[PDB]
Write a protein that binds this ligand. Structure first.
Ligand code: CUA
Length: 158
């Protein structure tokens, strides 16, 4: 089973959503190796560029629209992610890490850990507070997420 990951590029950090499992994160994602991954991408501000050099994969993120990317990580390990288009002050620290696990069980562990988080992203005041301008954000998980947050974000521009 391929995993679907939603991505919202914010002013100088990446917000990730896992619609299926009901968890969200900041600057870090995990998923099984040799497994298909579908990234549904958008931006809540200016235009950014989602890039992962060691997988040779890239895609732009613009407000109001949804872009798509598909990929398979051939080997387990962490892969560095960067924002490849100048977008202001925190351009250089607008990075993320992707962890391709050795199996699904290991991926299901990362997820469980995410569910043990006290932070949630289940309302309007949570999302906009996160969206506010910050730089070099450290990893962060959210145990819950608003049911249709991706669409909600996009349609603010629609
Ligand atoms: Cu976003 Cu550089």
């Amino acid at each position: 089973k391929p995993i679907t990951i939603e991505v919202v590029s914010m002013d100088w950090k990446w917000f990730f959503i896992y619609p299926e499992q009901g968890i969200a994160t900041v600057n870090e994602i995990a998923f099984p190796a040799n497994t298909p991954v579908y990234f549904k991408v958008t931006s809540n501000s200016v235009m950014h560029s989602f890039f992962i050099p060691r997988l040779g994969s890239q895609i732009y993120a613009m407000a109001g629209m949804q872009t798509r990317l598909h990929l398979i990580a051939n080997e387990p390990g962490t892969y560095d992610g960067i924002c490849a288009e100048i977008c202001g002050p925190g351009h250089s620290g607008m990075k993320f890490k992707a962890i391709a696990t050795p199996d699904r069980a290991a991926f299901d562990q990362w997820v469980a850990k995410a569910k043990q988080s006290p932070n949630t992203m289940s309302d309007m005041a949570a999302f906009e507070k996160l969206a506010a301008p910050s730089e070099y954000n450290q990893v962060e998980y959210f145990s819950n997420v608003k049911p249709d947050l991706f669409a909600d974000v996009i349609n603010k521009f629609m």
